[PDB]
Symmetry: C2
């Protein structure tokens, strides 16, 4: 059956470091909605990697009280570029 | 690599009929959060099946302005029973 772990983690920006994960998705669908946004890769040496909670393939659902569902790619990027503390809610399918 | 279609659809209850889809998930995790809620099955003859947008395996993210993320299973059931004639559902289909 379908299984989905709910991942919640808070990351602290470090001067000179980025969060260290790339994202994909958030594409405009023919029906007008925007596709889901996923974590594509995580740099082995980065704040997210050291945290260890997130993983590539996770779907991003929330970033600092901002929903990522039916949201364009550019908006999710701009929202991750925002304060010192970034609380992320994602889902990991298995 | 990962791709996910965002499905949004509004269903109308029919007097004498139920929505006609079962759900699974919403289990309490060791970290305290509740797992995602998925559509398990859809009755071949039901409002959701006739609508055709939803499918088994889709993860439910929103039901009539109520988030389904980090929500226990019983709460999702009660919210899919305490909802009015119109049910607006937002889910994601992974491929």
């Amino acid at each position: 059956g379908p299984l989905g772990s709910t991942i919640i983690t808070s990351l602290q920006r470090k001067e000179g470091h980025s969060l260290g994960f790339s994202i994909t998705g958030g594409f405009k669908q023919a029906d007008g909605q925007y596709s889901g946004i996923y974590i594509s890769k995580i740099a082995k040496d980065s704040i997210a990697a050291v945290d260890g909670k997130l993983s590539a393939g996770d779907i991003l659902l929330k970033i600092n009280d901002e929903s990522m569902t039916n949201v364009p790619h550019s908006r999710a990027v701009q929202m991750l570029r925002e304060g010192k503390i970034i609380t992320i809610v994602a889902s990991r399918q298995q």
